[PDB]
């Protein structure tokens, strides 16, 4: 329908889907580079994670402060261009290093390989910052203005955005894997750069069309000084405790990451069962999104967080039982993980809506940058914990630690709900 193809909501969905497709393809490419030229060393993956996390921790407040002053179209297009240019310029380097692979591995002094590694990391670390900035500005500012007083429209928007993310997370790696299988990594990392170029152009035009469509988007109602001011202004926000609770859920190993997949591999599983496991995780995620939508419609915005916390903790009780009780253990563990996905996703959806609905119109970027900073602080702590404990039994301890941290986060959200209602 012409109406549902010109309204300024399908264009947001299309732009977001293109962006996430490119992002996930590029992430898969970097993972392949790591596993090929370094043998997926857990230490180097953890160092890469620490670099990204620390970089967003020290700089989230500054990026949010920058977003809060300038104009929306300007900042959106600048962030988009920086992201896509960085991704293209790194895909070219990945192509070159994939071509002359064995040369580097076997007939060059190690310092050139080290330099290539730190260069790829330093470019990915800027791509990640640009993606963070576009996330802040589009999700937390543009999505909230393109749907006005109505509160169900915003919820549907967030839900379908999360569904798009969930689908692409499993669709894009498969496509790039096929292209690298029936071709070569030198072709995959070139298809990625071409995709990102054409996508940058199309998304630029789509952003301009959106900005032309809604006139209510041009009316901006709005060293260390800004950093400290932002953090202290985030401390005393009415939703500080719910935001802290959401932050706490990133300290976890119960998911699909660099360590738990290696654990599964050690438990003698197959590729196909892992693929269908990821598919089941995506199915449960979509279930969680629709469950959040219905709950929010019926009971209320705030108690949905409590329901989701109870669900996640209920499944994590199986997750923690899985440690003490050679197939029952791993089956219960994976069942608990895939079931708790529902509560996890619906809880973070409702916390996101709490964030982007109460805070003042002239401080979205700064406190959302601080929220990203806290999420990445806990992610940095997670990676630190993984570094010191690589052994398999240590995983039997990390499960307990992760459930404890989830319990802490939901205790904090319960305190918030008691203060409010």
């Amino acid at each position: 329908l012409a109406d549902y193809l010109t309204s300024a909501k399908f264009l947001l969905y299309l732009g977001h889907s293109l962006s996430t497709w490119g992002d996930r393809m590029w992430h898969f490419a970097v993972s392949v580079f790591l596993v090929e030229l370094y043998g997926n060393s857990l230490l180097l993956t953890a160092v890469y994670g620490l670099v990204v996390a620390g970089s967003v921790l020290v700089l989230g407040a500054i990026i949010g402060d920058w977003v809060d002053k300038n104009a929306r179209l300007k900042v959106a297009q600048t962030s988009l261009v920086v992201q896509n240019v960085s991704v293209i310029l790194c895909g070219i380097i990945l192509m070159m290093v994939f071509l002359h692979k064995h040369e580097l591995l076997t007939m060059y002094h190690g310092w050139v390989l080290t330099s290539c590694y730190i260069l790829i990391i330093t470019i990915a670390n800027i791509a990640n910052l640009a993606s963070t900035a576009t996330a802040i500005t589009i999700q937390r500012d543009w999505i909230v203005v393109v749907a006005g007083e109505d509160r169900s429209k915003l919820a549907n928007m967030n839900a379908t955005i999360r569904r798009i993310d969930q689908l692409t997370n499993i669709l894009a790696p498969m496509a790039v894997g096929q292209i690298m299988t029936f071709g070569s990594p030198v072709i995959g990392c070139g298809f990625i750069s071409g995709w990102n170029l054409v996508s940058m152009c199309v998304e630029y035009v789509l952003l301009w069309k959106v900005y032309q469509k809604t006139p209510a988007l041009a009316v901006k109602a709005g060293p260390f000084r800004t950093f400290r001011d932002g953090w202290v202004s985030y401390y005393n926000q009415p939703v500080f405790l719910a935001g802290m609770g959401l932050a706490f859920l990133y300290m976890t190993v119960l998911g699909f990451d660099c360590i738990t997949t290696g654990y599964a591999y050690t438990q003698g599983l197959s590729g196909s069962i892992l693929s269908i496991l990821m598919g089941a995780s995506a199915i449960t995620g979509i279930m969680g999104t629709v469950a959040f939508t219905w709950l929010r419609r019926k009971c209320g915005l705030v108690r949905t967080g409590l329901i989701s916390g109870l669900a996640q903790l209920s499944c994590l009780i199986l997750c923690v039982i899985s440690v003490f009780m050679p197939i029952i253990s791993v089956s219960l563990l994976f069942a608990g993980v895939i079931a708790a996905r529902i509560g996890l996703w619906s809880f973070d959806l409702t916390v996101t809506q709490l964030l982007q609905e109460n805070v003042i119109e002239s401080e979205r970027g700064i406190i959302n940058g601080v929220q990203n900073s806290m999420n990445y602080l806990l992610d940095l702590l997670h990676f630190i914990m993984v570094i010191l404990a690589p052994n398999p039994e240590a995983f039997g301890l990390l499960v307990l630690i992760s459930v404890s941290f989830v319990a802490m986060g939901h205790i904090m959200y319960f305190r918030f709900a008691q203060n409010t209602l």
Partner: antibody, heavy 118, light 111 residues
């Protein structure tokens, strides 16, 4: 379809010069490494050196003879020149093309014998 | 420099059976996810031929009776089943660092 073919002289005298040509039909010499290998009378193969796809060059330091691995990019040829030959140069010389996709001597030539005497 | 010791000298076998030849290095010839140990087949009167590359792969067109396996410093090539034409010489060559080196050669025969 890649093909190599050697050429050169039959025999030589002590303290002379040998200029073995290798002609490559089906692919340029500006793609992957081009190596000179020699099998002695017997079984012990031996690596002599290579010329790269970018004018680089390398000689086996364990070799007791002066070798020069040159190339001519017009006729699509590359040359091995042995100087100051000796009674321990009699061997069978093969070309090979160390590729860049799988990193092994994947295409050889028929090879030519060389013997020194009086 | 890396020295590849090949064993045994000559390997007699009988048709239909399975034959195993192995050459051991003196250092590690394996980098991240890749091991540089290739196997060559040379009949009397012809240049060598590529059977296995990167110690576990198979060339385009070689009979599937040839299998490669190994890592670290010990490798192994298996033929099953042998034929009357497999009486040849088999070499193992590494690529880890210059200068490259070839094995001693296993003089397979048929009884």
């Amino acid at each position: 379809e890649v093909q190599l073919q050697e050429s050169g002289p039959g025999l030589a005298k002590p303290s002379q010069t040998l200029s073995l040509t290798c002609s490559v039909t089906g692919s340029s010499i500006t793609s992957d490494y081009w190596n000179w290998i020699r099998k002695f009378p017997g079984n012990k193969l031996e690596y002599m050196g290579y010329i790269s796809y970018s004018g680089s060059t390398y000689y086996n330091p364990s070799l007791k003879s002066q070798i020069s691995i040159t190339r001519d990019t017009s006729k699509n040829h590359y040359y091995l020149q042995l100087n100051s030959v000796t009674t321990e140069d009699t061997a069978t010389y093969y070309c090979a093309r160390q590729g860049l996709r799988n990193w092994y001597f994947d295409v050889w030539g028929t090879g030519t014998t060389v013997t020194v005497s009086s | 420099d890396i020295v590849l010791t090949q064993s045994p000298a000559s390997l007699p076998v009988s048709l239909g059976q399975r034959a195993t030849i192995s050459c051991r290095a003196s250092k590690s010839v394996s980098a991240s996810a890749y091991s540089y140990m290739h196997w060559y087949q040379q009949k009397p009167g012809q240049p060598p031929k590529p059977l296995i590359y990167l110690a576990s792969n198979l060339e385009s067109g070689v009979p599937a009776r040839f299998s490669g396996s190994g890592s670290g410093t010990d490798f192994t090539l298996n033929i099953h089943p042998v034929e009357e034409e497999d009486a040849a010489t088999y070499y193992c060559q590494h690529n880890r660092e210059l200068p490259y080196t070839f094995g001693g050669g296993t003089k397979l025969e048929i009884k």
